[PDB]
Design a protein around this ligand. Structure first.
Ligand SMILES: Cc1cc2nc3c(=O)[nH]c(=O)nc-3n(C[C@H](O)[C@H](O)[C@H](O)CO)c2cc1C
Ligand SMILES: Cc1cc2nc3c(=O)[nH]c(=O)nc-3n(C[C@H](O)[C@H](O)[C@H](O)CO)c2cc1C
Ligand SMILES: Cc1cc2nc3c(=O)[nH]c(=O)nc-3n(C[C@H](O)[C@H](O)[C@H](O)CO)c2cc1C
Ligand SMILES: Cc1cc2nc3c(=O)[nH]c(=O)nc-3n(C[C@H](O)[C@H](O)[C@H](O)CO)c2cc1C
Ligand SMILES: Cc1cc2nc3c(=O)[nH]c(=O)nc-3n(C[C@H](O)[C@H](O)[C@H](O)CO)c2cc1C
Ligand SMILES: Cc1cc2nc3c(=O)[nH]c(=O)nc-3n(C[C@H](O)[C@H](O)[C@H](O)CO)c2cc1C
Ligand SMILES: Cc1cc2nc3c(=O)[nH]c(=O)nc-3n(C[C@H](O)[C@H](O)[C@H](O)CO)c2cc1C
Ligand SMILES: Cc1cc2nc3c(=O)[nH]c(=O)nc-3n(C[C@H](O)[C@H](O)[C@H](O)CO)c2cc1C
Ligand SMILES: Cc1cc2nc3c(=O)[nH]c(=O)nc-3n(C[C@H](O)[C@H](O)[C@H](O)CO)c2cc1C
Ligand SMILES: Cc1cc2nc3c(=O)[nH]c(=O)nc-3n(C[C@H](O)[C@H](O)[C@H](O)CO)c2cc1C
Ligand SMILES: Cc1cc2nc3c(=O)[nH]c(=O)nc-3n(C[C@H](O)[C@H](O)[C@H](O)CO)c2cc1C
Ligand SMILES: Cc1cc2nc3c(=O)[nH]c(=O)nc-3n(C[C@H](O)[C@H](O)[C@H](O)CO)c2cc1C
Ligand SMILES: [Cl-]
Ligand SMILES: [Cl-]
Ligand SMILES: [Cl-]
Ligand SMILES: [Cl-]
Ligand SMILES: [Mg+2]
Ligand SMILES: [Mg+2]
Ligand SMILES: [Mg+2]
Ligand SMILES: [Mg+2]
Ligand SMILES: [Mg+2]
Ligand SMILES: [Mg+2]
Ligand SMILES: [Mg+2]
Ligand SMILES: [Mg+2]
Ligand SMILES: [Mg+2]
Ligand SMILES: [Mg+2]
Ligand SMILES: [Mg+2]
Ligand SMILES: [Mg+2]
Ligand SMILES: [Mg+2]
Ligand SMILES: [Mg+2]
Ligand SMILES: [Mg+2]
Ligand SMILES: [Mg+2]
Ligand SMILES: [Mg+2]
Ligand SMILES: [Mg+2]
Ligand SMILES: [Mg+2]
Ligand SMILES: [Mg+2]
Ligand SMILES: [Mg+2]
Ligand SMILES: [Mg+2]
Ligand SMILES: [Mg+2]
Ligand SMILES: [Mg+2]
Ligand code: NA
Ligand code: NA
Ligand code: NA
Ligand code: NA
Lengths: 64, 64, 64, 64, 64, 64, 64, 64, 64, 64, 64, 64
């Protein structure tokens, strides 16, 4: 059985690095993370100083 | 990193109050709840006595 | 077996009351209405005097 | 010909009143606003003091 | 309030049995599981020996 | 001209048999049923004793 | 209250004329047909002699 | 950079001519219109005398 | 078994004729073409002299 | 690099067996088929004698 | 009230830089740009010399 | 007439480079490749040693 958690990673560099930010968080706290699917991307502009790229991913991990 | 939980709030009054019901539950159990996105709305009719409005929301909270 | 009818309710007060308007019509004419799913919401402005909220719902009823 | 503008209204009371907030802005600045379609709804929580309901609408107005 | 978890069940027999695999896992670890919605179906071919049917479901459970 | 009715069939055995349940109902009451399209699948768990698979189909029938 | 029926019109000439075919059928049998929304278009090729354009529309009519 | 405006053209003849109606309006008022994408089609019936086909397009134009 | 190829037909006359343009190409090169589904429509404006209507279709053909 | 082909398998038994029918065809003619994603399911009724379940899948295969 | 404009940025380097290209244009001409949502990404190949990445974003700005 | 092939490119560096990987493969084997549309992005984690970014694109090429 896989389960997925819906995480939004952030980066001031790129949408790929914001996806990695989410995946890195998942691998800090979960075992057997196996793949991630991008579900949305956006950029925070007027709530930060430097633009911050955001990549939301469903990160799947195998249960047991 | 944000994470989102998918909750369905209920109310016998309105779709706004059913969204609040979900958000109130999230804020009971999670820190740093930051925003919620409505993903579906419906009304339970023939499983309750009074119609019950249901609002399903992805509720985002900031991790740490 | 459930069947669904696609109805748009209207209200000059709110999207919840426009959903009820549809559901009330379904319960006038159908037996065993069991739940309704909101599929679209909108507001008529320049075809009415007062804005009229519209909530389109699939209303499900159990057959027999 | 109709044209549509994509506006997000806000309210601390309800999703209907946040839709009205957008429509009121459109009618302040545009002639012949004729209808609005809800395209998304959400609630700002951790960027405000009181929750703020947001309703994004495409507001259509007739050209000429 | 309901909450949903996004699980992918697997089976070497059928998409129905892969949905049951997910639901069985949810009922092992959660109380008051109430319904599941299929969100995607697929078949793993070249990472297994026998084809493995996969059914991804949002499984809803009532909170408290 | 074809018309479609939106029916949810149920089965305690499989999603295929729940699709047949809907189609069988349509053919009980309609002439010239010609095809059905699956639009959603789900499983009722905590409102029944045995899990009940549900397959919602648009069932098309030719008019005249 | 509006209700919508999901009809597929056909024409050997064009997608507009197939939409009219559906609408004409609705106006034969329903009062107060008010608008139709195109939901899908396709062409039957290998089940007919001449290609037949098909336009599926939700046709809305006002109830009473 | 391209920008798009969301326009609904109308015609009493066809969905192609309603798309042209929108595009003609855009080219009256904008420079460097480069392409248009159809996003919805419908027919107004009970608000006009003759049916009026409507084609909504995102019309893209190159900025500068 | 059916297989589908994703083709965009073009016409300077209409979206129906652009769908035919794709289908004609498929029937030039494939046997047993059986139906086509429209998946997108658009108009090329600023890359041509006369507007060119484009209709993208999945064209299905029966294998063997 | 993976490439996907869009195939509709058929079966008179079940949607799982119709998915296998497509996959079996792909593995007859392609090397390194690695997974398949279900994209639509339906049932042919009034063009056959016995109902025929149809499962459309994107079947992915690794190139080289 | 927020309003959004639908812009396609371009870059010969990356999809992140094409999103920035759009956002930079919006900030040249609009005050209080607050966030951008990616809605589509693509690559122009046979209309340019070097591939050009394109990122279409809805860019939101706060009105007043 | 354009035709599109559905390819998933991979890269251990970025989603832009995974889109290029697909496009490079298409240009190895097809003439007149004209543009590509991103349809999905994901990251393989637990089937590789280093994360591998995947970008699925419909790559369009002009026929003749
Ligand atoms: C992608 C993105 C979407 C956003 N959407 C909203 C929104 O709807 N409303 C708001 O007050 N702030 C928002 N902030 C947003 C920030 C980002 C980065
Ligand atoms: C929104 C809504 C959707 C529902 N869908 C189903 C369903 O598919 N099947 C069922 O047995 N009960 C259902 N109950 C539903 C109740 C609500 C309120
Ligand atoms: C939600 C909503 C959508 C509408 N869409 C249209 C439309 O597309 N064209 C038209 O002539 N009138 C329209 N009227 C509309 C009225 C409402 C309330
Ligand atoms: C609906 C809604 C959506 C939002 N989405 C985001 C987001 O994606 N990222 C962010 O930094 N803030 C966000 N803020 C959001 C605020 C609201 C109200
Ligand atoms: C449904 C399904 C989808 C898949 N998608 C991918 C994918 O995108 N990329 C990959 O390397 N493996 C994949 N494996 C997949 C396996 C299954 C069963
Ligand atoms: C598929 C499925 C969906 C359902 N959705 C709901 C729902 O939204 N709310 C509720 O009270 N019961 C529900 N019951 C559901 C039952 C089934 C089987
Ligand atoms: C638009 C269109 C879609 C169709 N889809 C199918 C199908 O999925 N399967 C089948 O046996 N015949 C089909 N026939 C189709 C005919 C048309 C015109
Ligand atoms: C396409 C189309 C859609 C429409 N939708 C609505 C609607 O939702 N409500 C209404 O009062 N009038 C409507 N009028 C509509 C008119 C057209 C032509
Ligand atoms: C429908 C349509 C869509 C198009 N989209 C694009 C695009 O995204 N970018 C571009 O450079 N040219 C484009 N050209 C387009 C041309 C047509 C006809
Ligand atoms: C799933 C399915 C969809 C179909 N759609 C159509 C259609 O749109 N029109 C038609 O003439 N035949 C159709 N036949 C269909 C057959 C099947 C099995
Ligand atoms: C993303 C993208 C999409 C495009 N779509 C089209 C199209 O549909 N037709 C055309 O003539 N040119 C097109 N050009 C396109 C260029 C790009 C970059
Ligand atoms: C994007 C992506 C999606 C995937 N989906 C699946 C899947 O559904 N099931 C599986 O066994 N492996 C999968 N592998 C996947 C790998 C990637 C990279
Ligand atoms: Cl989710
Ligand atoms: Cl429907
Ligand atoms: Cl495809
Ligand atoms: Cl828009
Ligand atoms: Mg930096
Ligand atoms: Mg988002
Ligand atoms: Mg009360
Ligand atoms: Mg729901
Ligand atoms: Mg009043
Ligand atoms: Mg509507
Ligand atoms: Mg107050
Ligand atoms: Mg939003
Ligand atoms: Mg076995
Ligand atoms: Mg999947
Ligand atoms: Mg049994
Ligand atoms: Mg459902
Ligand atoms: Mg003729
Ligand atoms: Mg169809
Ligand atoms: Mg005329
Ligand atoms: Mg519309
Ligand atoms: Mg001509
Ligand atoms: Mg297109
Ligand atoms: Mg048999
Ligand atoms: Mg289909
Ligand atoms: Mg360079
Ligand atoms: Mg695009
Ligand atoms: Mg490296
Ligand atoms: Mg994918
Ligand atoms: Na989730
Ligand atoms: Na219907
Ligand atoms: Na394809
Ligand atoms: Na817009």
């Amino acid at each position: 059985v896989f389960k997925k958690v819906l995480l939004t990673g952030t980066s001031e560099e790129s949408f790929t690095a914001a996806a990695d930010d989410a995946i890195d968080r998942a691998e800090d706290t979960l075992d057997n993370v196996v793949w991630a699917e991008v579900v949305d991307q956006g950029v925070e502009i007027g709530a930060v100083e430097e633009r911050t790229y955001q990549t939301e991913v469903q990160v799947a991990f195998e249960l047991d």
